[PDB]
Design a protein around this nucleic acid. Structure first.
Ligand SMILES: [Mg+2]
Ligand SMILES: [Mg+2]
Ligand SMILES: [Zn+2]
Ligand SMILES: [Zn+2]
Ligand SMILES: [Zn+2]
Ligand SMILES: [Zn+2]
Lengths: 162, 162
DNA sequence: TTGACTCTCTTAA
DNA sequence: GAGAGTCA
DNA sequence: TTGACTCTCTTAA
DNA sequence: GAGAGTCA
């Protein structure tokens, strides 16, 4: 809601509920042939999810609170960032999973950045393989690697140069 | 169905027409602080585009040829790959710009790969900065870099561990 | 047979 | 990656 | 008030 | 990143 006190109250209640989600250990590639360990706080697969939480899509949830008799609702991962600018360089700020685990609501696994920055973490070599993200990755992106390209650049005639 | 010879004829007419597009010299980052040069063959901004070409979206075009009274149409960047497999690992193959220049139709700037592989090239450090793509990038991805993350992982209480 | 428009769709964040 | 409505 | 569902939308490849 | 329709 409008007041900083009301916003802090929302964040604290969210943290308390999410803090009771099951903690699931995930071992992850860091890059550079190294492995690390993350502790994700995972929202349940089916109702009930926790006080204030409801599922609006296969892997989408919302957090809802009644303030001054009004219902206020947010994307379930956006709540840690309610005091931050909601845009940057004219681009919408999004909740971005450093653990690449959508059910996880651990705020120590979330950052707040453009959708492009968010997406790009999928291909990052990781914190021990050359990550240059200023807010550092927690793991190598799941899509990092050589790819599976079917056909490379080619021409039949002699009309083109690189 | 079009024969292999007929498909080759389509590819040849496409190359003939694209080869007459304006050729634009672009200086590009290669990674590792080096600069290189790419020569893009750019479809015009407005009609007419060239024999067989028409715009179906702001940055989408199609190539059309009529053979034995039947109209055939393809995405304008897909024609170089008409003799290639059209899927891999259960994923549809897409035209992927190594020059990241959508108007460019230079087949030496295109590869044929999954949409995930395609997208991921946007963040690649480049052929002189650590690219691991098996079909190597021609340049550093336009979105490579530290990013512009607004807020990092954080908690107000002590409910969480990383 | 061809050009120049029109429309909607896919994917995974 | 999002917002919002329908019911109980 | 709170829970459990429903729907469509945004972005940039 | 795509496929397909209309009109002359
Ligand atoms: Mg993400
Ligand atoms: Mg691309
Ligand atoms: Zn997590
Ligand atoms: Zn990173
Ligand atoms: Zn090009
Ligand atoms: Zn690359």
């Amino acid at each position: 809601a409008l007041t900083n006190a009301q916003i802090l109250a929302v964040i604290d209640s969210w943290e308390e509920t999410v803090g009771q989600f099951p903690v699931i250990t995930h071992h992850v590639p860091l890059g550079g042939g190294l492995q690390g360990t993350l502790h994700c706080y995972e929202i349940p697969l089916a109702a009930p999810y926790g006080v204030g939480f409801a599922k609006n899509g296969p892997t989408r949830w919302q957090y809802k609170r009644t303030i001054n008799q009004v219902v206020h609702r947010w994307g379930s991962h956006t709540v840690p960032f309610l005091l931050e600018p909601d845009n940057i360089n004219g681009k919408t700020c999004t909740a971005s999973h450093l653990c690449h685990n959508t059910r996880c609501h651990n705020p120590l696994h979330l950052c707040w950045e453009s959708l492009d920055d968010n997406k790009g973490r999928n291909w990052c070599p990781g914190p021990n393989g050359g990550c240059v993200h200023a807010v550092v990755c927690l793991r190598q992106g799941p899509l990092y690697g050589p790819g599976a390209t079917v056909a490379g650049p080619q021409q039949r005639g002699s009309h083109f140069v690189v």
